[PDB]
From Swiss-Prot, chains A, B, C, D:
Amino acids binding AMP: 11-15, 21-25, 89-90, 117
PTM annotation (Phosphotyrosine): residues: 192, 221, 241
Upper classification of the organism: Eukaryota, Metazoa, Chordata, Craniata, Vertebrata
Activity regulation field: Subject to complex allosteric regulation. The enzyme can assume an active R-state, or an inactive T-state. Intermediate conformations may exist. AMP acts as an allosteric inhibitor. AMP binding affects the turnover of bound substrate and not the affinity for substrate. Fructose 2,6-bisphosphate acts as a competitive inhibitor. Fructose 2,6-bisphosphate and AMP have synergistic effects.
Principal EC category: hydrolase
Subunit structure: Homotetramer.
Binding site for Mg(2+) 1: 74
Cofactor note: Binds 3 Mg(2+) ions per subunit.
EC number: 3.1.3.11
Pathway participation: Carbohydrate biosynthesis; gluconeogenesis
One GO-annotated biological process of the protein: gluconeogenesis
Protein's organism: Sus scrofa (Pig)
Amino acids binding Mg(2+) 3: 95, 98, 257
Name of the molecule in the record: Fructose-1,6-bisphosphatase 1
Length: 312, 312, 312, 312
């Protein structure tokens, strides 16, 4: 096909008619090189830590885009303040290999990422990173499934891209994605049944045993955030990782997990909340600050927020 | 790798020990070709039903193997009788592509197959396929996730090969696989909560709220039989697709879904029962009949089985 | 490897420390997408005109870099003046599939390219393209051989890049390349023996039968410009496609053949001449204007220029 | 493609007609695996001798085939005798990787092999390999250029398969190949001009300056035997590596270079003579002996042969 839409071309038709210098583009391009290598390594996984190496990889490519100043990793303490010579205006937040554990069982996992723009006239510090999701310029993730699909959500909406392994380019496959309004799938680890706050518990029973005599929601849960979000994004559904006492303020770190997802979600007509407040407005204080997250189709997030409101 | 132990080097080398004709090797070598092609089809089945390409593909590779004579496919009303010029001693039942609907959400999908030996002297027929799972000589499945995997269970063991895309060969990685006795995961579509029979519903409870003040089991359910079974085999645990009111005879078909996995399971030291009898011991009356299926790490399936006749 | 040098990263460390906006980079990146697709299509050539499609491809990607204004193809009459919305400052000259004929015999072929910068304050026209090689900002070519290697020569020197088919990135493999000073290979189509100008003819006899009793030069000639230049670039050697009467002013078009090569050559310490004047200083008058070209190791070009001088 | 005719589907299907044991198929299937791996090794043998990985690889695949017993490799002083546990009825001579030095310049390289049947009853030995080329039962070569090709010539024809990297299978593309009677290309290292014998040197002349006021032949010489032979087979013409003073016995070794190509040539209706006798009719005395080789479209080789005894 003589007219292929590589994501490079596509972001160049978002971040160029907008006159913004297309810095974004080189940052994104670089993320692709890293995402691609992670996919190859993972496909041949069992024939050749992976996340450390994928961390190193992401960082290196990132720096070299000459479009970053601060970087936060799940795998790193201090947010990496990019050296001066290669600086640029963006703050990138990431989980390079989400699900490192799950490779062994061959379950789809991914590289999540959040991006910010430094809102200051100074020298970078991890404070430049402590902005809330409402200030994300773009967030996305790449899933290493039966295909390697990159989902990128910028201010206009969400577009899925898939890796054509032959030409090695993320090709555009879905434009301006919008989630289903209501779903039929609730995804959550019911092993934690006992420790669930009552709001959640009433909800699970409402999905399993619908009072208003419909059919019970189908339970799903790959147990990989990337996978469950994506099934949620396309097929609709509600995904919940509320807090219990074991992980008292939840398990998913805000910064580069709850937030990038929640942004992708909201741009696609999907709510994302902690249970009290939306995940995109919490003022982030520690780069590794955790937060509960409930995302998915609006009419379900809402069917649960009512319930949460009806309990305090 | 220099002395690359291909699936074929492996199957041919063990085949030599039966002082045989070479058809197992031909069969499997040909099946492999359907698998690579399906894997490739799936890795880009979003850049622009599938079941059928996958299906026609399998029938084709298998006819030409000169090793088949009766083929039972999920997709065909009747069995397929291999033309004489090309008939051989084996009978293959297979689901060519499992969970096809699940490919939109990027769920790890697969091809499951079971191979029988035509023991009788008359014209090949369905009856030959109407053998108990116990009788199989070879089984496994090919998984299509982050990597393409082929687990093959024969008289001597269950083994795992992963396709190396660089060379288009299936290479041996896990040898003589054995499942953990007891483990921490139950896998079941909890959406059918109101449908389940008491035995199950008590067991679910026992795992979430464990009576011995222990750690509860985790919940998993990818919703693609192959991903869940492969998880159950590698990490240990239990998977269940019990009969319920929407499906009193089970959902997962016997000949091509239940019996192969069942066989692979028992060969690794797990069990697979319908709660009332071994899956492999069922004598199929119809080539398309279903079965309840509870497979996994022994002690757990057992814990269940007791609950069955603790309720009998 | 966590620190991969993709050509994107490499040109970004040439066209960024130089403050030039890295427009160049997106142009180059785009050429890579096209180059990559051509390689895939060609590898699977005999299992699926190719140059028309590769022409269309190059053009499309090119336009979309938002870095071009004029484009000249071997396969096109009127140099394509890029539409305004996607304009930029560069003029790109190219032969998308050099050797279209040779695919059938499985001989390495390539995509050559020359780049200019519009030296005017107006509306683009093919005049913007009629600059001589001395005004090329960068020239290169990609070879579709047993590997797909891109050779890129900018003002600093030449760097070879090779396609790592797994991650799909041109990885850097040779920095600041310099040709051998003297060679031992003369490459030319001696079928044309008869029509050769005497300067050339004395030279062939001097290579075959060395008067100063050394050993005869090895004759080579893949009969694909890309291939012969590249063998010339690395192993040294002299490549000659002088004019005869059949192709009286030679066969290779200046614009996107003789010139990009000659530039690559000169930046690597290799002369390139028509026989009278250097190929990089001829004022180009017709985009399809032809020119003789002799390139390669300095001490040989020179061993031949003497001879040419000694004949007029 | 659905009914993909693999090299194996092909070799197995013709093998059935000899009412055989299945070793040709095993042999070739195993050889294929060495080829893919070498192709892959070459496609990235610049991102960081080779002969040896390639070599060890071939010996390995072939021992394990359970089809060999004597193996004659370019690289080993002595023949390799397959251990009894693994011996079978075939003898394979092969150059594992040809023109290794030519990989730096990206020259299309290849693996050439010839297979014999051990007819005698004693312990396998060199003598078995000391058979005339006429006696071969199977031959061909695998080319590694823009695409990886496997030409296989057996009793019934010469056929061409191209490796489809997407599936890791060699697929049949050209069927029952036949060379053109006469054609327009001579191929020879003209660097040895002062070394050649009169017969050749007159013939060269006759083609450059054709006496019948005709179109001269074109000159080609990639300098990698496989590329030139494959060209000669597909497009017609002549290739020559005549004996000269630097090499009076020819350069190209007989058993593994000359005889296979020779066989492939004659099977397509070309000829291959040393100028004094058919290449295939030579009875090798040493497994490493060389031969003069002139192969190609009949009429031309003939035109030469006459010149031989027009000079006798
Ligand atoms: Tl992680
Ligand atoms: Tl994480
Ligand atoms: Tl997490
Ligand atoms: Tl299916
Ligand atoms: Tl199924
Ligand atoms: Tl099923
Ligand atoms: Tl061309
Ligand atoms: Tl050209
Ligand atoms: Tl040309
Ligand atoms: Tl060699
Ligand atoms: Tl050789
Ligand atoms: Tl040779």
């Amino acid at each position: 096909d003589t007219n292929i839409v590589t994501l490079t071309r596509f972001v160049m038709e978002q971040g160029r008619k907008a006159r913004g210098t297309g810095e974004m583009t080189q940052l994104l391009n670089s993320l692709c090189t890293a995402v691609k290598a992670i996919s190859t390594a993972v496909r041949k996984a069992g024939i050749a830590k992976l996340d450390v190496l994928s961390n190193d990889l992401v960082i290196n490519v990132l720096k070299s885009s000459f479009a970053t100043c601060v970087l936060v990793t799940e795998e790193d303490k201090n947010a990496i303040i990019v050296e001066p010579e290669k600086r640029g205006k963006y703050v990138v937040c990431f989980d390079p290999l989400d699900g490192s554990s799950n490779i062994d069982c061959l379950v789809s996992i991914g590289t999540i990422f959040g991006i910010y723009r430094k809102n200051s006239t100074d020298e970078p510090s991890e404070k430049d990173a402590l902005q809330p999701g409402r200030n994300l310029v773009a967030a996305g993730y790449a899933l290493y499934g039966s295909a390697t699909m990159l989902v990128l959500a910028m201010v206009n909406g969400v577009n899925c891209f898939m890796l054509d392994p032959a030409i090695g380019e993320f090709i555009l496959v879905d434009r301006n994605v919008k989630i289903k309004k209501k779903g039929s799938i609730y995804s959550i680890n019911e092993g934690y049944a006992k420790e669930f706050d009552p709001a959640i518990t009433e909800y699970i029973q409402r999905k399993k045993f619908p009072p208003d005599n419909s059919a019970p929601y189908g339970a799903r849960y790959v147990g990989s955030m990337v996978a469950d979000v994506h099934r949620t994004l396309v097929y609709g559904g509600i995904f919940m990782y509320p807090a219990n006492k074991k992980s008292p303020k939840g398990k998913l770190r805000l910064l580069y997990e709850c937030n990038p997802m929640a942004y992708v979600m909201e741009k696609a007509g999907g709510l994302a909340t902690t249970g009290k407040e939306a995940v995109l407005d919490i003022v982030p204080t520690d780069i590794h600050q955790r937060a509960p997250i409930i995302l998915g189709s609006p009419e379900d997030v809402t069917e649960l927020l009512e319930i949460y409101q009806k309990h305090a």
